[PDB]
């Protein structure tokens, strides 16, 4: 946990990375006037409501995040992040910046991965949102605690494959408007998982709006037309 | 006692703690130190094994002076010996200040014994690797000599040894009769014993380190004068030869 | 993987192998080396397998000056044809996921060569059973069904204590955590129905010379190796716990 | 619910506002010159303290500049505070300009004046 | 799980890459004096003295990977008479890969004529001695001959309790098992970094028959060359 | 001068106490029901970073509570804020109430922060 | 074989009555660069061998200034060296600040030993893995004090520790009488010769890889950098 | 001859037989894992250069800040674990700005490096608190700044102690880059020459091409203050090389 | 440490619900090598133990096993001398605390209860080991007259009338129960003779005034007194006649 490998790798952070790799594919796109998140779903939920398994959440109104890995540590980090957002809104009385909360989460992960009395978080928080001036944002922390801004990131199951596919696909022409960003995110998710449908958990957030969990009916119709475009 | 010899808080199936025994035997590893409690006073003798000529004379001194009256001869690890010497100095000074008179040797002996035993109790801290002979003489208390085994025993001795040649030294001492004589002859006798116990084949060389406390030095632990040490060394060499 | 020292490829037909095991400490290997030195068992070959980390050194059993200047690889085998006695000698730690190939290779070797009885000296952990190890004798045995009934009745007459049959995942499969190699080797032998016996001892890590003496005495009691001062310790049993006293420490 | 005594006294030409707030764990001794916190130093007495005797207060700079001068200054300023506070770890937010024996004695008597232990 | 472990096994395994551009080296060309240099100091001494006269054409390199060291395993032959071979192996070969390296070098069809001279350096602490390790000479060296070497060693052999493991032991065991004359030289040095004292202690070997005619004397050229590799990678701030 | 505005508030239920040391601008704030200096962090507005730079002086590094409160208070006010949050666990919602609690006092007594 | 079980921690006693961790710490000094310390009747010269690498990468300041009459040289771990130097500076400064008296070297060495003994005794700690050659000049006179990684310390006439320092030790032992009755320049030259014998045959004493700190009867401890060591190098025979 | 596998690397306080703390060396290996960062100090100031190597074009180079500005007169380049360097950077900024606020004096870069070391070494020393500093920081800092003494470049490894250096290359190309530094350096080097040489060596030891996007460079000068070269200035300099 | 084994770790229970460390502490008490007895008479309480002096250089006066905690409360020690002295000092501290706080003398029952609580602490916390020694407290109580309480490292403190501890504890207890069943007057001389002859017959050796040490506390003189060698010799003559 606090010991380095001969090559200079902390074992705990690498194990957390493996846990993240076993997690779902959190996919996001930094669109202008619109930020789109997307996370692979294990369907199931035959007797369980989708409300409690919502991997994509809203830290306040101007920030929404998704994770990939263990869901318990994800829940606790989400709780801490939203508490920090509320505390900032109370004291400073300003909308919390995506950079601010991303740095807070990265610092928390760094603290938990440094001390040997506690294990690192086994998740990678993919954070999106709009700042005070309305600039779209896209960030991705790691168990180590390295927060990095991205144009369109994708972390989780087969992270590298989806990331390179999206890099090949991501272009300003594809980032224009918002429907196009939705198509990009859905395409990345479908590339990850061929089944699609219920597995595609889609969330969108606009410039001056809150996080809108896109309804499954909207998700499937976008998939259908995406299929139509391919033919 | 395999498996039960890694911690000082673990009892072996037989019922003994092996760390303390290893501390005693590591004390054995060092060169022998001898103390004698004669009627006049207490005389110390240590086989100061010289390592290299580079070290200046007096370095790695084994005979510490806890106070004006109380001295100490040590064995085993010298770092632990110095730490215990500092602790005994602090205790003696504290008693001298709070009560106003010099500490009886028994009080220092059992206090340091309790401290070392406390160290032997716990698994975290390791037992002290040094055994020392808290010896002193007082016009009222009398010539007293206490050995503090790392285990934590405070036994009053008339003469004892600690180190590699402890057994042979004890045999020779018990051949000697340590009652009713001046320390002037005890210095010669202890030098003689040190010479016999010394092994030239294994130990390349050694230096005689003799200190005494008694009426001759007005109950003060002071290194023996150079002339007396030379006379004792000459007598020991003459006795050893042939 | 037996490679003869010379070129005659001595046959081990109708012999009894004496193999050690990587047990708690080095009880099995120490006892094996001790009996090798005592019985003056000459080297006959070199069991070169890809399972142990390689190591080299002079002859552990120096004896004569000429014999002193030799080479001892990780896996070498000595034998004494006078008593139809052969003995392998392990002196190396294992490579990950290579012990079972060793088990298979040595089982095939003994089956093909003709070595009938393989004796596996080893040692298990001190706690062993549910406080039964503290109450009962550390020594045990574990002999495969294929073992000759004569040896079985000899052991029964010796009035020894059989293996506790430690509870494992189904329900009482013999488990020897200290030996490690011992369990898999025994299972391989049982599959091959090769006569062998595991002679272990509940001990803990540390100095294990007395444990080796006890185990060799156990083996002497069974097979009358020497005489059921006593055992001639190898010259290898030197500087096995330290490298001298640093003068500045004391 | 803590007890704090503050005595603003002008010694050596500088208005040192010595503050002493008593916590169970760490008593805070704020010798603030220029009306600011300044360097913060933690003095932790040795737990062993030989045979229940004078301990060794580990000198540790928490904020500001690391200097043996300031380390010794804090040592001498809070040694008696720790000793008379039941061998309690005591923090010192010293922010003085000149560090000399006369100043140290003046601040020592000022703290004694503003004692809460 | 198993697939990931298999991928790691490939990553760790030794891969033989030809330098002239699955046949083993000795399988490709036979040798007569294969010189093995293990460690930075051994290869440095080899380059200084033995690889001073002649083409010494690169023939192969056994690239591998392990958590400790990925350096190089380049093999050389004189190219004036390819009968004599050489190896400058600086990368540390792990235990699970030493036998793979042996298979890549020799395989299963040895010539049984090479005088395998192994050059390696160990630390003084490894030397099992009756007295304290500090009393030993800093650069002293030892030798380990095989059964059929028959050539007198230039230095005293190792003591009984002392042993050698790792790749030099692997090659020596291979030679002993297959009856190949050889000798394993141990340069017990307190400094494992590139220091010219270690190679000065390695010097006595070029005098003996093992690696005798390969060096074209010229101590001045070799001595000057030794000062070339004295400059090495900057150390850390741990020790001063 | 230094105004030692010591006060207490019945945050939630436990009577958590407070301490203030104004100095000039280096405000010091302590929080905790029990009189202990468990944690301490100093934060002040920085011209190089949007978030005021803060460092955990002493205490458990995996707390991120004192540091965050110090940063927020240093943004609200000017200069240093030595926050010393010393609640054992308090989950995380209770910390928000304390932040509200101190906030109300600053409105009531701007001078006695 | 057996020592592997009794060397994991510093609080474990081996069946041989040894603590191998202290031995490993004592070897950590050897892991460092070589240093030489010798004294005369009036001066105490501390000569250190700077790592013979590109000084651009790192200025290896082996010789450190502690007080106006105490200075030390580093052989071993740098963290422990820095901690010990800071501690000694605190004690010397406290002495001169409270009692207005120079701190005697012997008292400082005793304090160092007492401080360094604690890690050996305590669990989860490690002995300070650095060897100090304390060149000081108190009222008694010049003093070269050898501080081993173990709390044990030696008062030495001439000493040298670090890598391949045995040659320096031999040279010093062969010329103690000369050291005792030598002046500043001759004593410095003797120390430099010892260091050179520490160096291989090919390598020689250059201004880049030599640093010397001298404390004397009327001389405060002054560290002479590469430019300031040439005067002693000049006039010193190569052989 | 029975050798038993024994390991001492797990314990951070455990010494190897020769006296080596293997955990610290593993931290140095982690340092080597990071990207190259070369800084050069001259009489006219200190030049700091480091590669902002990126994974995929989607990575935003603006996010990567290898060179920071601790104070107007203090800069720092890093290589290794940036998250680890975050705490040390915050500590250094706190020290500098607190010193300015209280004593109205610019804290010397040497003292800032000292304090960072106190924070750095806390992983081993003391660590009294349960959840206190546990592991050494796997990041190396090139604290380049100009103070009363003048241009001062410092370097710290996970060992936790700073050393005043003149030309250091830290990262994947720790060596080779240092050989180029040794070949190109003298006390008479001017700031322009130092920048040109640093960028040339960056190109030599880089796998990508030298463009202003993937490179970052700054100079701390006596008369001026910390000045991180902008996109246009960086493009001009690389065009010069 | 993480000592998994039940036999070498106090906290972990044995598979049969037993604490092997406590049993090994008892074995340590046996390893002490000496034996002690205690008898509660109708007029006093006695404690008799042998004083085997190794060799002659050791001062016989210094070596002792009869200790007094409170002026009325005596004690006899069995086991390692260091552990015995530590427990004696702790009992003295407890007596001083009781005197200071409650204001009156510590009852023997309460003293043994406190020592048993300390033993419970030792045998429950894995950090330390149970003290390898058994202590028997004697004293005069205003309500119950003579009182004999034996405290043991397990934490068992039941009061006795006649008890023994050491290597020969079993045979001594058997003989003592045999004597108790007779139930004679148990006068001072009677009880002292019973104890001394029990020890002599269990050790199967003749006793000398210097070979043993005897301490007694009586109702007439509540202050604990250690009988001098003269009194022991007189009692031995009494047994002889």
mmCIF file of C-alpha atoms in Angstrom, chain C residues 33-208:
data_model
loop_
_atom_site.group_PDB
_atom_site.id
_atom_site.type_symbol
_atom_site.label_atom_id
_atom_site.label_comp_id
_atom_site.label_asym_id
_atom_site.label_seq_id
_atom_site.Cartn_x
_atom_site.Cartn_y
_atom_site.Cartn_z
ATOM 1 C CA UNK C 33 22.582 -33.728 4.129
ATOM 2 C CA UNK C 34 23.377 -35.011 7.620
ATOM 3 C CA UNK C 35 22.629 -38.628 6.724
ATOM 4 C CA UNK C 36 24.518 -38.202 3.435
ATOM 5 C CA UNK C 37 27.616 -37.060 5.318
ATOM 6 C CA UNK C 38 27.263 -39.779 7.960
ATOM 7 C CA UNK C 39 26.860 -42.643 5.472
ATOM 8 C CA UNK C 40 29.491 -41.343 3.009
ATOM 9 C CA UNK C 41 27.142 -41.703 0.043
ATOM 10 C CA UNK C 42 29.129 -41.023 -3.124
ATOM 11 C CA UNK C 43 27.771 -38.802 -5.879
ATOM 12 C CA UNK C 44 26.457 -40.695 -8.908
ATOM 13 C CA UNK C 45 24.598 -38.176 -11.059
ATOM 14 C CA UNK C 46 23.035 -34.758 -11.505
ATOM 15 C CA UNK C 47 19.248 -34.348 -11.606
ATOM 16 C CA UNK C 48 19.108 -31.250 -13.814
ATOM 17 C CA UNK C 49 15.556 -29.880 -13.858
ATOM 18 C CA UNK C 50 14.099 -26.456 -14.648
ATOM 19 C CA UNK C 51 12.253 -26.058 -11.332
ATOM 20 C CA UNK C 52 14.779 -24.686 -8.804
ATOM 21 C CA UNK C 53 16.777 -21.465 -8.929
ATOM 22 C CA UNK C 54 20.320 -22.440 -9.994
ATOM 23 C CA UNK C 55 23.133 -22.389 -7.458
ATOM 24 C CA UNK C 56 26.711 -23.675 -7.384
ATOM 25 C CA UNK C 57 29.383 -24.314 -4.787
ATOM 26 C CA UNK C 58 32.146 -26.629 -3.680
ATOM 27 C CA UNK C 59 31.452 -30.121 -2.376
ATOM 28 C CA UNK C 60 29.285 -29.802 0.769
ATOM 29 C CA UNK C 61 30.810 -33.035 2.117
ATOM 30 C CA UNK C 62 34.457 -32.091 1.736
ATOM 31 C CA UNK C 63 36.018 -35.036 3.585
ATOM 32 C CA UNK C 64 39.224 -35.513 1.583
ATOM 33 C CA UNK C 65 41.063 -32.596 0.001
ATOM 34 C CA UNK C 66 40.544 -34.030 -3.476
ATOM 35 C CA UNK C 67 36.817 -34.407 -2.852
ATOM 36 C CA UNK C 68 36.725 -30.906 -1.349
ATOM 37 C CA UNK C 69 37.362 -29.286 -4.749
ATOM 38 C CA UNK C 70 34.140 -30.222 -6.536
ATOM 39 C CA UNK C 71 30.941 -28.583 -7.797
ATOM 40 C CA UNK C 72 27.494 -28.865 -6.189
ATOM 41 C CA UNK C 73 24.539 -27.822 -8.358
ATOM 42 C CA UNK C 74 21.067 -27.037 -7.016
ATOM 43 C CA UNK C 75 19.890 -30.635 -7.575
ATOM 44 C CA UNK C 76 22.367 -33.499 -7.161
ATOM 45 C CA UNK C 77 21.870 -37.141 -6.186
ATOM 46 C CA UNK C 78 24.165 -39.410 -4.164
ATOM 47 C CA UNK C 79 23.815 -43.168 -3.727
ATOM 48 C CA UNK C 80 25.329 -46.031 -1.734
ATOM 49 C CA UNK C 81 25.010 -49.230 -3.819
ATOM 50 C CA UNK C 82 26.138 -51.381 -0.874
ATOM 51 C CA UNK C 83 22.692 -51.080 0.743
ATOM 52 C CA UNK C 84 20.842 -50.395 -2.533
ATOM 53 C CA UNK C 85 20.424 -46.860 -1.194
ATOM 54 C CA UNK C 86 20.061 -43.757 -3.369
ATOM 55 C CA UNK C 87 19.381 -40.242 -2.118
ATOM 56 C CA UNK C 88 18.494 -37.010 -3.877
ATOM 57 C CA UNK C 89 19.513 -33.723 -2.243
ATOM 58 C CA UNK C 90 17.588 -30.482 -2.728
ATOM 59 C CA UNK C 91 19.574 -27.345 -1.899
ATOM 60 C CA UNK C 92 17.594 -24.590 -3.636
ATOM 61 C CA UNK C 93 14.411 -22.538 -3.361
ATOM 62 C CA UNK C 94 11.706 -23.071 -5.959
ATOM 63 C CA UNK C 95 10.663 -20.962 -8.928
ATOM 64 C CA UNK C 96 7.038 -19.842 -8.981
ATOM 65 C CA UNK C 97 4.696 -22.459 -10.468
ATOM 66 C CA UNK C 98 7.425 -25.065 -10.949
ATOM 67 C CA UNK C 99 7.118 -27.455 -7.980
ATOM 68 C CA UNK C 100 4.416 -29.591 -9.608
ATOM 69 C CA UNK C 101 6.533 -30.200 -12.747
ATOM 70 C CA UNK C 102 9.269 -31.345 -10.358
ATOM 71 C CA UNK C 103 6.805 -33.728 -8.713
ATOM 72 C CA UNK C 104 5.820 -35.195 -12.075
ATOM 73 C CA UNK C 105 9.396 -35.464 -13.350
ATOM 74 C CA UNK C 106 10.702 -37.163 -10.209
ATOM 75 C CA UNK C 107 7.723 -39.532 -10.068
ATOM 76 C CA UNK C 108 8.482 -40.558 -13.649
ATOM 77 C CA UNK C 109 12.178 -40.894 -12.790
ATOM 78 C CA UNK C 110 11.544 -43.204 -9.838
ATOM 79 C CA UNK C 111 8.970 -45.243 -11.765
ATOM 80 C CA UNK C 112 11.321 -45.794 -14.711
ATOM 81 C CA UNK C 113 14.568 -46.296 -12.778
ATOM 82 C CA UNK C 114 13.177 -48.784 -10.248
ATOM 83 C CA UNK C 115 13.732 -46.902 -6.978
ATOM 84 C CA UNK C 116 11.029 -48.545 -4.878
ATOM 85 C CA UNK C 117 10.668 -46.532 -1.656
ATOM 86 C CA UNK C 118 11.051 -42.744 -1.648
ATOM 87 C CA UNK C 119 11.512 -41.232 1.819
ATOM 88 C CA UNK C 120 10.498 -37.574 2.070
ATOM 89 C CA UNK C 121 11.922 -35.883 5.161
ATOM 90 C CA UNK C 122 10.109 -32.611 5.845
ATOM 91 C CA UNK C 123 8.617 -30.490 8.622
ATOM 92 C CA UNK C 124 5.246 -28.851 9.261
ATOM 93 C CA UNK C 125 4.242 -25.774 11.228
ATOM 94 C CA UNK C 126 4.417 -25.749 15.015
ATOM 95 C CA UNK C 127 0.754 -25.005 15.739
ATOM 96 C CA UNK C 128 -0.331 -27.676 13.230
ATOM 97 C CA UNK C 129 -3.571 -29.151 14.584
ATOM 98 C CA UNK C 130 -6.174 -27.777 17.022
ATOM 99 C CA UNK C 131 -3.807 -27.812 20.005
ATOM 100 C CA UNK C 132 -3.128 -31.502 19.307
ATOM 101 C CA UNK C 133 0.447 -30.773 18.217
ATOM 102 C CA UNK C 134 1.230 -29.260 21.625
ATOM 103 C CA UNK C 135 -0.235 -32.305 23.400
ATOM 104 C CA UNK C 136 1.123 -35.046 21.111
ATOM 105 C CA UNK C 137 4.557 -35.800 19.690
ATOM 106 C CA UNK C 138 5.732 -33.595 16.789
ATOM 107 C CA UNK C 139 6.813 -36.578 14.690
ATOM 108 C CA UNK C 140 4.346 -38.124 12.236
ATOM 109 C CA UNK C 141 4.286 -40.254 9.095
ATOM 110 C CA UNK C 142 2.318 -40.327 5.847
ATOM 111 C CA UNK C 143 2.762 -43.456 3.721
ATOM 112 C CA UNK C 144 0.989 -44.101 0.434
ATOM 113 C CA UNK C 145 -1.229 -47.199 0.090
ATOM 114 C CA UNK C 146 1.266 -48.670 -2.393
ATOM 115 C CA UNK C 147 3.867 -48.906 0.391
ATOM 116 C CA UNK C 148 4.947 -52.483 1.044
ATOM 117 C CA UNK C 149 2.814 -54.078 3.750
ATOM 118 C CA UNK C 150 5.992 -55.257 5.480
ATOM 119 C CA UNK C 151 7.005 -51.636 6.083
ATOM 120 C CA UNK C 152 3.457 -50.847 7.206
ATOM 121 C CA UNK C 153 3.508 -53.543 9.885
ATOM 122 C CA UNK C 154 7.017 -52.460 10.891
ATOM 123 C CA UNK C 155 5.704 -48.929 11.460
ATOM 124 C CA UNK C 156 2.710 -50.317 13.350
ATOM 125 C CA UNK C 157 5.070 -52.276 15.609
ATOM 126 C CA UNK C 158 7.144 -49.113 16.102
ATOM 127 C CA UNK C 159 4.056 -47.548 17.747
ATOM 128 C CA UNK C 160 4.310 -44.202 15.979
ATOM 129 C CA UNK C 161 1.688 -41.452 15.598
ATOM 130 C CA UNK C 162 0.011 -41.168 12.203
ATOM 131 C CA UNK C 163 -0.725 -37.919 10.398
ATOM 132 C CA UNK C 164 -3.500 -35.881 12.002
ATOM 133 C CA UNK C 165 -5.372 -35.653 8.668
ATOM 134 C CA UNK C 166 -5.915 -31.916 8.968
ATOM 135 C CA UNK C 167 -9.373 -30.805 7.874
ATOM 136 C CA UNK C 168 -9.349 -29.320 4.367
ATOM 137 C CA UNK C 169 -11.902 -28.440 1.697
ATOM 138 C CA UNK C 170 -13.914 -31.563 0.719
ATOM 139 C CA UNK C 171 -13.119 -33.112 4.435
ATOM 140 C CA UNK C 172 -10.016 -34.530 6.137
ATOM 141 C CA UNK C 173 -7.511 -34.533 3.279
ATOM 142 C CA UNK C 174 -3.938 -34.650 4.560
ATOM 143 C CA UNK C 175 -2.526 -31.113 4.469
ATOM 144 C CA UNK C 176 1.107 -30.236 5.192
ATOM 145 C CA UNK C 177 1.364 -26.423 5.012
ATOM 146 C CA UNK C 178 4.967 -26.308 6.228
ATOM 147 C CA UNK C 179 6.293 -28.712 3.619
ATOM 148 C CA UNK C 180 4.305 -27.264 0.729
ATOM 149 C CA UNK C 181 5.929 -29.569 -1.807
ATOM 150 C CA UNK C 182 5.063 -32.543 0.409
ATOM 151 C CA UNK C 183 1.306 -32.536 -0.244
ATOM 152 C CA UNK C 184 1.529 -32.284 -4.037
ATOM 153 C CA UNK C 185 4.391 -34.787 -4.150
ATOM 154 C CA UNK C 186 2.385 -37.273 -2.078
ATOM 155 C CA UNK C 187 -0.655 -36.834 -4.324
ATOM 156 C CA UNK C 188 1.486 -37.361 -7.426
ATOM 157 C CA UNK C 189 3.005 -40.502 -5.907
ATOM 158 C CA UNK C 190 -0.433 -41.847 -4.981
ATOM 159 C CA UNK C 191 -1.588 -41.254 -8.553
ATOM 160 C CA UNK C 192 1.539 -43.092 -9.725
ATOM 161 C CA UNK C 193 1.236 -45.618 -6.860
ATOM 162 C CA UNK C 194 4.940 -45.191 -6.069
ATOM 163 C CA UNK C 195 6.022 -46.399 -2.639
ATOM 164 C CA UNK C 196 6.968 -43.415 -0.497
ATOM 165 C CA UNK C 197 6.600 -42.021 3.014
ATOM 166 C CA UNK C 198 6.647 -38.475 4.390
ATOM 167 C CA UNK C 199 8.401 -38.103 7.754
ATOM 168 C CA UNK C 200 7.643 -34.607 9.055
ATOM 169 C CA UNK C 201 7.899 -32.774 12.373
ATOM 170 C CA UNK C 202 5.911 -29.874 13.830
ATOM 171 C CA UNK C 203 8.563 -27.154 14.129
ATOM 172 C CA UNK C 204 8.862 -23.390 13.713
ATOM 173 C CA UNK C 205 11.257 -21.142 11.829
ATOM 174 C CA UNK C 206 14.662 -20.593 13.399
ATOM 175 C CA UNK C 207 17.530 -22.894 14.270
ATOM 176 C CA UNK C 208 16.499 -26.384 13.151
#
